[PDB]
Amino acid sequence: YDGTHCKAPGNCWEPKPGYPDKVAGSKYDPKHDPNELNKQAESIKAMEARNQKRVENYAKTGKFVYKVEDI
Amino acid sequence: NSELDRLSKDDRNWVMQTKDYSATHFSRLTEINSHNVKNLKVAWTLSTGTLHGHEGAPLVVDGIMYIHTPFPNNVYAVDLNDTRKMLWQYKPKQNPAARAVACCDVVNRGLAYVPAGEHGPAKIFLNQLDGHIVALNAKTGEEIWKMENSDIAMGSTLTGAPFVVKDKVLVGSAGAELGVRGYVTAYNIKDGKQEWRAYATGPDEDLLLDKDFNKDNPHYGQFGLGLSTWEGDAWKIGGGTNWGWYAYDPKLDMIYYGSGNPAPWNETMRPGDNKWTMTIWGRDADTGRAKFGYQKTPHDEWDYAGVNYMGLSEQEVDGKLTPLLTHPDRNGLVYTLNRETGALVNAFKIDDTVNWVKKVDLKTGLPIRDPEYSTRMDHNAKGICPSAMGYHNQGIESYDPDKKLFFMGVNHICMDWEPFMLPYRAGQFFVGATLNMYPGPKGMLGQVKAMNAVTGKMEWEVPEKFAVWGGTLATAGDLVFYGTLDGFIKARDTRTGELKWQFQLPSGVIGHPITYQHNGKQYIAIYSGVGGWPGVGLVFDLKDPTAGLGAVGAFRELAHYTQMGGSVFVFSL
């Protein structure tokens, strides 16, 4: 693996000698919990929805309020 | 923002961390110069009221200096006609649990500013460690709006400064050491409304790509790569946070920045190029759509987090005057690209000891890897240069357009590295490597260098006892000023590197110097307060050489020279 043999433009990864093409099912399988993987995107959706509430309240009243329970 | 751009051209001001949208860090002031800087004295000082690392530096606009701290990221304003009084203060209330998800000290790279405003009054912007973007009235300190960008429960913080472009303020990301998938966000300065958000990995709609993305250099890669260069869903936790600096070309209406390292550090857990971590981006300002993207470090094996500054200049390339960006990466290469097309102009080694890469082939754009300095499971890789701290880190550097030279504070640090398997759990660290660091082959930990970024020609090079971390300020006085981790501010002649002045500050420096004119006199200002990644051993009383992600062993002598601190020093003749 010297970085110069490319399967497609922008895609030059190769396994090192003795390592696998794919990790799933290998001794290096990260075995990620799909539920853990999805947590940060769920958290972002929730922040984005709270922020949209703060924006809407500012457009409606002309006064900024951070705490979404106080709107 | 055209009015911010105009204010940046006035030597009474220092309106953004990078000084101006080109990140020149160059002042045309000459009152202080190579022939009288030996007579520079302390004029006045301020205490910040906190310890920990003090990154970035003050802003100065319209006769007011603005200061910021590490966590809890207090802000204050000082009228330069009454330097003893604080005009206003803002003191955030933040969950102290924010501190526990910061890998390398609770540093904050500083404030941004926008002038008044259809939007309306002039504002100061602060990114808090706890993930909030805050807009304050620049004259009164009143909180105008505050939005949630990042969630500390996911290990996601903010440490990079906000960046103002037209009617938007851009907010980065941080937490790649905790599996945070990187994203940059534009908010409207009037009401805090999110305008656009561009992720560093994953599907093309998340990356926010122009239909003509990489039209000029299709060999960089175009569509589908934020999925196809990862195995399965590993991109969801895949790093690429942007915690460094930006530049902006108003004529092209393009913003430039670097995305950070892929997660975890254990390369074996994430086969593939890992795009678009480690990438130099050119995005349209209004839409956030990338017009180009160059991946410097495919499939990172070394945490060469690609977040360092972007310095714009206009220089001859084969006799034709060309708009450029120059970018000294952690990986030890100095990249210069055409900032309109994204074409590679040069990529040279910042020090000849860089060994992970033999060279970058400029036609293919690919770094030719040396497998002797790769990292991989079940191997302790020895002697890799640079270390994960980089041969260059978060310091903003400087450009003298008359000499066509960049001046850079450089690190000389190498490492051994061995990965380990570990699970991802949101909110927990997700590193998976054990490191030992030490001086590079020349034997010291720092250097200051002057270079031409088109030719790669080094004008001069000088050693420093420790890594020079906080960046540089250059002036038409033929001087480059910088701070050192051991607690000096120094000035060197830009033609030769000769040391012309030094002053013993209370604590080490991890930010940059600034200069400004007030009431017809030139001042130089800097923070003193050691910390950040090199200071982690002394800030947290760590003793295991592999702690602080390998920084503790390399920097174990630093606590012999400095304590923590928190102060602003202002110098004049």
What single-letter amino acid sits at B33? N
Let me know: does B30 contact B11? Beta carbons within 8 Å: no
Type and span of the H or E element at B408: strand B405-411
CA B248 to chain centre: 15
Q: Which residues of B191-208 are buried (b: 16+ CB within 10 A; e: fewer)?
A: bbbbebbbbbbbeeebbb
Q: Could you tell me the CA-to-CA distances from B472 to B26, B27, B397, B526 in Å, in that order?
A: 9, 11, 5, 11
The token pair at A9 is 């433009």
Distance CA B398, CA B23 (A): 7
Write out the catalytic residue numbers of B: 303
Distances (CA, A) of B274 to A47, B331, B402: 27, 16, 40
Q: Do B169 and B187 meet the contact criterion of CB atoms below 8 Å apart?
A: yes
Which residues form the domain of A69? 1-71
DSSP assignment of B328-360? E-TTSEEEEEETTT--EEEEEESSTT--SEEEE
* A40, A47, A48, A51: best to mutate for the B interface, most B CBs within 10 A: A40
Q: Among A11, A32, A44, whose Cβ lies nearest the Cβ of B424? A: A32
Residues in a beta bridge with B491: B481, B501
Give bridge partners of residue A8 from the DSSP assignment.
A11
* HSE (side-chain half, CA atoms, 13 Å) at B366: 19
Nearest to B54 by CA among B66, B41, B39, B70: B70
- Any chain B CB within 8 A of the CB of A35? no
Contacts of A59 in chain B (CB under 8 A): 191
Residue owning tokens 């656009």: B196
B533 is in an annotated binding site: yes
Does the distance separating the beta carbons of B149 and A28 come in below 8 Å? no
Instruction: Please confirm whether the linkage preceding B441 is cis (ω < 30° from 0).
Output: no
Phi-psi region of B423 (alpha: psi -120 to 50; beta: other; left: phi over 0): beta
Parallel, antiparallel or unpaired: strands B26-27 and B472-475: parallel
Token digits of residue B260: 């950070």
B383: tokens are 């002697």
- Method used to determine the 3D structure: X-ray
Residues 6+ apart with CB under 8 A from B320: none
Going by C-beta distance under 8 Å and a sequence separation of 6 or more, which residues neighbour residue A27?
none
Helix (H) or strand (E) holding B482: strand B479-483
For residue B376, what are the contacts with CB-CB under 8 A and spacing of at least 6? Answer: A16, A19, B267, B268, B301, B419
Contacts of A46 by beta carbon, 8 Å cutoff, 6+ apart: none
Cβ(B196)–Cβ(B280) below 8 Å: no
| Contact call for residues B233 and B202 (beta carbons, < 8 A) | no
Burial status of residue B135 (CB atoms within 10 A of its CB: 0-12, 13-18, 19 or more): buried
SS3 B198: strand
CA distance B205 to B196: 12
Q: Phi and psi at residue B295, in whole multiples of 5°? A: -85, 110
Residue B57 Cα to chain centre, angstroms: 12
Strands B344-349 vs B333-338: parallel, antiparallel or unpaired? antiparallel
In angstroms, the separation between the Cα of residue A24 and the nearest Cα of chain B is: 8
Cβ separation of B151 and A64 shorter than 8 Å?
no
The answer to whether the beta carbons of residues B305 and B257 sit under 8 Å apart is no
Contacts of B229 in chain A (CB under 8 A): 10-11, 13
CA distance linking residue B92 with residue B124, whole number of Å: 14
Looking at the 3D structure of chain A, how many domains does it have?
1
Measured in Å, how far apart are chain B's first and last C-alpha atoms?
34
- Are B194 and A51 in contact (CB < 8 Å)? yes
Judge whether B505 and B569 are in contact, CB under 8 Å: yes
